[PDB]
Amino acid sequence: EYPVLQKILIGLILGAIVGLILGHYGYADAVKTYVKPFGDLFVRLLKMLVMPIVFASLVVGAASISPARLGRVGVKIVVYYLLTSAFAVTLGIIMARLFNPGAGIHLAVGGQQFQPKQAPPLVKILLDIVPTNPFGALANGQVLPTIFFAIILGIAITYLMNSENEKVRKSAETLLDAINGLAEAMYKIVNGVMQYAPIGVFALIAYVMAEQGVKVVGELAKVTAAVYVGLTLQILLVYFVLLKIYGIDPISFIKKAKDAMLTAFVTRSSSGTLPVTMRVAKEMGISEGIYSFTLPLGATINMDGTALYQGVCTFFIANALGSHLTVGQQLTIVLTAVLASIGTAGVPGAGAIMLAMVLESVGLPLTDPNVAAAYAMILGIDAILDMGRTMVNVTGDLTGTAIVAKTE
Amino acid sequence: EYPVLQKILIGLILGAIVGLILGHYGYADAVKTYVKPFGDLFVRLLKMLVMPIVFASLVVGAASISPARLGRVGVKIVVYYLLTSAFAVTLGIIMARLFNPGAGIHLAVGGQQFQPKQAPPLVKILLDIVPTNPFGALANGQVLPTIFFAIILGIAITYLMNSENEKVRKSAETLLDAINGLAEAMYKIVNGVMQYAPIGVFALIAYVMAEQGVKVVGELAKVTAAVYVGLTLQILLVYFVLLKIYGIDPISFIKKAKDAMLTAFVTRSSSGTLPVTMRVAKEMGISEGIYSFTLPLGATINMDGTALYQGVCTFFIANALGSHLTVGQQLTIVLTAVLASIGTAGVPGAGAIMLAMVLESVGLPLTDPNVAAAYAMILGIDAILDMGRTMVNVTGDLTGTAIVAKTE
Amino acid sequence: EYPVLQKILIGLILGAIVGLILGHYGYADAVKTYVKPFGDLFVRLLKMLVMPIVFASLVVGAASISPARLGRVGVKIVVYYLLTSAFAVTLGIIMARLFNPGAGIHLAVGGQQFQPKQAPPLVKILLDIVPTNPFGALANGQVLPTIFFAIILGIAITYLMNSENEKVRKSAETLLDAINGLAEAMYKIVNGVMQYAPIGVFALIAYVMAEQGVKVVGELAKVTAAVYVGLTLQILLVYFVLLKIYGIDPISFIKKAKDAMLTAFVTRSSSGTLPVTMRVAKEMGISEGIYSFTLPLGATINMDGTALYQGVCTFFIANALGSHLTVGQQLTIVLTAVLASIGTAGVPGAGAIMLAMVLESVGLPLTDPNVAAAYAMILGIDAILDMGRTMVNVTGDLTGTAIVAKTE
Ligand SMILES: N[C@@H](CC(=O)O)C(=O)O
Ligand SMILES: N[C@@H](CC(=O)O)C(=O)O
Ligand SMILES: N[C@@H](CC(=O)O)C(=O)O
Ligand code: NA
Ligand code: NA
Ligand code: NA
Ligand code: NA
Ligand code: NA
Ligand code: NA
């Protein structure tokens, strides 16, 4: 009974209210132990679907599309991704000069120290996209190396169709069918898991507002508004405009990508949201060729929401330490924050941990006593910011896929 | 050559003789390094078949029968499994009052103090039944999450069969067929492995008896006879009885379930016995809809043998510690042992580890010096006790499966 | 554009020359960070293919051929492998008495010490050949357990083809197809990756010669000649001969095993070369039933080149230490090095680590101050000796598969 998109808006509005109120009376722990378990289940059920929906769909996508098209799709979507993420930092820097976050605040030094993780070599990150055991890749996480093998196998399936033989032609047929069976099966599960969505959506914002909704006051409120307006200016001033330029109706696009966004926002897992956003692409008739490859890649590569968050936050820590950033340093963030955004995981809370890499680049390391105590205020409300981020991170990928789709 | 059921009975009788003799002359070391490995190969060979046989069969299972039907079957088998587990504890309690194991014996306090392995939250265990990577589930054991994803998968295939499409209807059929292929194959294998069964049976008891046969004398003899006749009354006073009331011939049931029951007794791994118990279920012509779900679920959930074991051993420790248990402390045993038995793994010797959980609830902890030296005497003959447990643990799943089967 | 078998030879010759030049002028680090990655990309690409190609092919192979044939092929190949490995050591010893590596040399003692790894019991290594989760076998490396289960599955698919049922016989057919689909699909992928091979080959020797080429002077040069002249005399005197005897024209055998021999040489992974060496088998038209099972087993069991290397080194150390080995100690190397060779991993540089095992049997342990400092000279030019080893390790697998196929 009842429409599904309504249930989520009701679970979202009611849950955000129920969270705040329950949380302001000090029931931060009563929500976590009682409410959260239902929001947890919603994420768990989705994660389930990620690996099969991604692997199977993309073998069929790479079998259906031309190997010259797939490669063209690739270069087009990377150029899109890179420029959207670059414009996203500058939008968060402009939002950090418009609003002033932590302008004249002096924070309690010596409270908490942090320890930055040494990032692995670029060579190793790049060579690691080619999996040495595809069964291993599936067996544990690893969407990117899966993407790679999938395409290669999909492509090989096509070459086995052109075969003179009959025994080969059929066995290649039999494989691709069954793989597509799983694919089609998965897209059916996501609907069923979307049926639980409202209950899960309710519980998740109830937890986030109950645990952190009470700390969105003071200079942490002004850093919050700087972000959410900045992200709102990313959806309108960038996506709505680039969809208008490419002749796609931007209003009915939000109609088609509603379920992805609300999941991304609440779930705060770009990775987790993948089977919803992938269905949302099939909803709007984009070829399994294109969206099977662009979405999972964009799940990790394209993070406009994160790119922006790391901008406004770099400025926050720079304002609450006294000294401002050079006009040459403002262009040194744009590069590193896009590099940090690419590198960030499609998992909850990973942006703030990756914000540490864009903090050394400007000159204020996270081992510095007072920088560390400033960072800890932001990490205090990170799950509030995380919600906006992920949603834009996800919206960005779908916007891209739609554009590449109309071009071909 | 030769009948196979006879071979296992010869391997069992000869093995337990050769083991008791060799072990009495102190050749526990020789039988461990020389004979036991042949009994291991049999165990290994069985484990092998579990993942593919469970998964592949249950996908077919959930597609084969109505999603409503599977639901009812579930509620029916859970109501079966709980009541049979609760009857099992009370039967062991009467067996621990009929006999007095550890009646007037004092033990050498301080030999070995045991240690708390903190249990995980039930909310987490329950949440853990949903697998976040179906591959990762299969990849490493994990029967329950696989049961989840399997049913879910199967159920989705059914929906693709009712599709208006042709390309969707065929590729879903193709998939169900391939997965059915695997299922069928793993049944064929378990027949093969069942030919090595006698050799592996021989070696397995030969080791259990060599290692622990001698110690089954004195008060430990009384506690052994307590358990065994208690288990015998579970089969004759509960299984034989409930099979009659439901209109299934108890003796033709025991004939068809023989291989399963023997594997279980010798293997002492309710979980390793799964592919034999699953074959046995198919041998009695039961539907893959029913037994594909019930047997793997019951392999972990329904442990009447473990429940009865924990019963008698609670009374054993209580008698060896002097003070008896109240009528309300005995009704407190019933509930905790049900939890402990369900919570107990289908792996060998695991119930003695969960016995500690049912000893905290009465008021006699495992870290208390003289309880710890009383529990060590039990752990000393646990392999002799484990054989019986596992056998009844597994018999009950088949009994329950058969009963729900006839009713449908 | 351009043939492949030409491109590889130009990459190897130009690459071995560019390597030696760059490294002699101290750029051994420059090659390692710049050139080497390309050569690693090749290895990742091949490795990708090993798990699906080995599994899918052998299930088809074992379903393709008679379980009596496969059994016979197995005993024929094991005999072949053990005999050729034994002969390889006796050839190495004859090279190391003809040449005198480390005759009049006395080394700087005490610089470096080594740590002998504790090898697990043979019974444990044998038992672990049966997997306990086939999905865990694939998931992480584990060619041998896969091999085992693959034959089993293949043989079961067959018995399912003889069933009176329609629904069983078609599902058995469907599964076999989809598995075969993948197998055919992987072989095409190797055709593609072999296109990158010359770029990979060029880089991989650039590295090896840059790092260790310059070290091949003095007494270390005399050992390198000893191993190579031996390995050559294994190719001509053992393969070219045993092939002619069995009636396969050797000259065209080398022609059709070119891609494998050169991948093995440059890549140094007997293991990672397998998808090339399995294709090369198919190219000369050997039955899948035979090479699906001989070649992957051979990758781990049959290492003529390693066995030879261990012979000529066991004679280098002993020469540097001063006191010679007995006639009965030479025959003690023959036995230990065949053993060690069988045990030695299909992975780059493993024979050297395994050389310790054969050294202890002659009475010169690796903990000994001066043995450990001579052994570090051998370990210095290892990649150099490893290239030749690996090639001859693989060639004997193809020679064995070829011979055994001709006898049927
Ligand atoms: N939850 C965010 C993580 C981040 O913003 O760093 C995402 O997956 O996009
Ligand atoms: N062998 C028993 C283990 C136990 O009951 O503790 C089983 O798996 O059923
Ligand atoms: N690279 C060699 C290692 C060895 O010589 O043991 C091989 O894979 O065969
Ligand atoms: Na994203
Ligand atoms: Na990212
Ligand atoms: Na059980
Ligand atoms: Na249990
Ligand atoms: Na080899
Ligand atoms: Na080896």
Coordinates of C-alpha atoms in Angstrom, one line a residue, chain A residues 133 135-136 139, chain B residues 43-55 135-141 182 185-186 189 193 275, chain C residues 51-52 54-56 59 128-154:
Chain A
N133 CA 42.3 -12.8 -8.9
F135 CA 37.2 -14.1 -7.8
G136 CA 39.1 -12.4 -5.0
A139 CA 34.9 -12.1 -2.7
Chain B
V43 CA 35.8 -34.6 7.3
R44 CA 37.6 -32.2 4.8
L45 CA 35.8 -34.0 1.8
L46 CA 32.5 -33.3 3.4
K47 CA 33.1 -29.6 4.3
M48 CA 34.0 -29.2 0.6
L49 CA 30.4 -29.9 -0.5
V50 CA 28.7 -27.7 2.0
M51 CA 28.9 -24.2 0.4
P52 CA 27.9 -25.2 -3.2
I53 CA 25.3 -27.8 -2.0
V54 CA 23.6 -25.4 0.4
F55 CA 23.6 -22.3 -1.8
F135 CA 30.4 -13.5 -2.5
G136 CA 32.3 -12.9 0.7
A137 CA 29.7 -15.1 2.5
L138 CA 30.4 -18.0 0.2
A139 CA 34.1 -17.1 0.0
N140 CA 34.5 -17.9 3.7
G141 CA 32.0 -20.4 5.2
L182 CA 25.7 -27.3 -9.4
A185 CA 26.3 -32.3 -9.1
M186 CA 27.0 -31.8 -5.3
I189 CA 29.6 -36.1 -5.2
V193 CA 32.5 -39.3 -0.6
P275 CA 25.5 -32.5 2.6
Chain C
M51 CA 42.0 -18.5 -11.6
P52 CA 39.1 -18.5 -14.1
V54 CA 42.4 -23.0 -14.6
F55 CA 39.0 -23.6 -13.1
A56 CA 36.7 -23.3 -16.1
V59 CA 35.7 -28.6 -15.2
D128 CA 45.1 -29.4 2.3
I129 CA 44.9 -30.5 -1.4
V130 CA 41.2 -31.1 -0.6
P131 CA 39.6 -27.6 -0.2
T132 CA 37.1 -27.0 2.6
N133 CA 35.3 -24.3 0.6
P134 CA 35.7 -24.4 -3.2
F135 CA 34.6 -20.7 -3.3
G136 CA 37.5 -19.9 -0.9
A137 CA 39.9 -21.8 -3.2
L138 CA 39.1 -19.6 -6.2
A139 CA 38.8 -16.5 -4.0
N140 CA 42.4 -16.7 -2.9
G141 CA 45.1 -18.2 -5.2
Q142 CA 45.0 -21.9 -4.5
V143 CA 45.5 -23.6 -8.0
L144 CA 45.9 -27.1 -6.5
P145 CA 42.8 -27.2 -4.3
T146 CA 40.9 -25.7 -7.4
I147 CA 42.4 -28.4 -9.6
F148 CA 41.1 -31.1 -7.2
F149 CA 37.5 -29.8 -7.0
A150 CA 37.5 -29.0 -10.7
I151 CA 38.1 -32.6 -11.7
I152 CA 35.4 -33.6 -9.2
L153 CA 32.9 -31.1 -10.6
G154 CA 33.8 -32.2 -14.1

